[PDB]
Design a protein around this nucleic acid. Sequence first.
RNA 1: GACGGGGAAUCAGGGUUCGAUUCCGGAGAGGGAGCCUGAGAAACGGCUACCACAUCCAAGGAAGGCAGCAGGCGCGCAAAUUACCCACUCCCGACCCGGGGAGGUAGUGACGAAAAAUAACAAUACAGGACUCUUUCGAGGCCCUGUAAUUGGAAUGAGUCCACUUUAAAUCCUUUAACGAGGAUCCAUUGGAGGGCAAGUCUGGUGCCAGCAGCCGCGGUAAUUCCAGCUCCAAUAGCGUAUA
Lengths: 57, 124, 185, 141
Amino acid sequence: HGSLARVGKVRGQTLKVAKQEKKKKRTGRAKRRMQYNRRFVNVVPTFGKKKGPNANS
Amino acid sequence: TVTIRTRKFMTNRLLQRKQMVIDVLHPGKATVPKTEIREKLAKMYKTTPDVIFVFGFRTHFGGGKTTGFGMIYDSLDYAKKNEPKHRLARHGLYEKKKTSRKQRKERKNRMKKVRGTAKANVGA
Amino acid sequence: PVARSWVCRKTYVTPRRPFEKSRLDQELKLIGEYGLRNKREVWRVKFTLAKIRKAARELLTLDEKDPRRLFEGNALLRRLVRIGVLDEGKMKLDYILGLKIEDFLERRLQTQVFKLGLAKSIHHARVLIRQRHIRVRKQVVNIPSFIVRLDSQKHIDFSLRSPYGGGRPGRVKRKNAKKGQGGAG
Amino acid sequence: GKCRGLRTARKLRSHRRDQKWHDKQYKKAHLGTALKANPFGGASHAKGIVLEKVGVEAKQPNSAIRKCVRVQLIKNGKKITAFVPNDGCLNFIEENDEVLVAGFGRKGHAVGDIPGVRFKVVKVANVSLLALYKGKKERPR
RNA sequence: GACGGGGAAUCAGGGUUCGAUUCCGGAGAGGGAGCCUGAGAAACGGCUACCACAUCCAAGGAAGGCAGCAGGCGCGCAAAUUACCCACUCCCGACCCGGGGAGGUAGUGACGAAAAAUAACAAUACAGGACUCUUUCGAGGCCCUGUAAUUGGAAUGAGUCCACUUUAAAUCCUUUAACGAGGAUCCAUUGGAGGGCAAGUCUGGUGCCAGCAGCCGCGGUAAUUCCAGCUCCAAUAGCGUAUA
């Protein structure tokens, strides 16, 4: 407990996890090429409502 | 295989020199220095390789071409008379006193502080 | 009082709507099909097309048989037919407005190398141009946004100082050859 | 317009000038009172020394309090009240320390649920609050 | 919170705002005042007195005006080297020869503008796709499209570095030999992900607390908005914030 309005309480008692070592991301011309490919030539004709890029329902 | 083609050739009786624009073709190598240009212009124009004064060589983007200026003088006296001093210093017949502007200005002010014969004495 | 120029201008205009859908769709389609790097290039081509269209509109609001109209309109028409976006059968003042962004982006050096038949893809074409491999009339070009003319299209080939058009090999060929000489010797 | 005569320009100009002065944004933007009452004095940022820390409360829709400091500027001597933006950034500030205050978003207007506060703290002890909050720089000891 | 103008930003059409600032004209060298010389000055890198400020001194006296070029103090949110040269542009003088912080050169420089790296290709991996069929299986997959840290050979550039060029002498650019990339660690950031407004009814923690929020509003012990991880979105060597 301590006090109600403690300055920096939630960020102070937040759990601390580390970053995961991952492969680097392409940037520049190849990023737009990958975006164009994934958005326009890997698509299938579907119906209803189009799924979002981050949809995880 | 370094060839030289001339351009805009025009002679002056009033300057006793011939101005022209030099186009140098050196494909596959670096920029050629000016002294082989001087001997090659001496060979093609049948002149001694000491009155030819060249400068301003810029290499085009890509490599292979170089455009610059060059003059051919009649004799050494005309080459010594109407020329800038830095080209003569580049060819090695003129040299200047090794003093900066700050020393000259301070010596001039210190000489201005006094009057008379001692003006030369204070200037050392 | 210094001897400078102080003359410069922007070559692009940002759109009014920052987050739209269809506009971003055709911009992404143009970037992916022409192998561009960012939206600044397609906005620049759109800006210069808009300037040409604005000049054509303000000359088309004018009346006929005006000598300055005939003069700088013929100047604009000869520029547009010498750049490669217009034809001789459409040498008219209204046919400038029927132009597209495809016509201006098709005279880019990248797609000209890609459609000429010496590059595998358009990104490979940009890599090939950027690494000093081609030349246009005895002069190499280091950049992909070199908008060619109609009279200079048939002169594009590989540069002399390149391993593709006949010349000294690169560094990995020589390094692997030296490694092979060391292993065999 | 109302005057449609060919020789009616002085009347139209005078009426437009009077109705332009009889406005709001042109009225604050052309007198010296609205800029004289501004503690910044027509400036984007200002410096001053923090005297104390006050916990100002929110409005009636929501129940929280806002951590805030009081600043006495040096350019004019006025005393202002500036909000420390982020979470836990009040602990980087102590008494008798200099800060760089700025506007808070709506050009001299209370933003959100904080009453009577029109300024925010950008930098403290000649380093930004964002660098201290993200753990990039450190307070000089 | 006025030097004026030529002009600048925005701009269907009209309009609004700015113009201390390299060109032209005017004014001043702390502020007023008076004057010598000279063709031309009420001159201040000329003089004479006042006040304010101010330097040295054996204390009788003497000497000043960086709103010039560098640099310093104070001030404020706010602005660079106590460098080199008369070679280029011109100017003054008895004068082809001397001088010029006028000027030119480099340093500092993310005010801003233009161009433009951070990857491409090939065979397997495996999701589909067009052509008569196999109705719906396999295949021709010869012709593709795409990405998985599967693999191998070609490439050019930053940076180090003979030289050459440039230059008053250099430096920068260009040219050019010797080196110089596989997770090519030679590793691209800035703001977001409820609506406005492109983009997770994901996971864990606090629980009207901490805080987010330009505006609606979000947090009350199952948060799409807080605090962290994953994923995604907008621009890209650029992005966000505050004031006219």
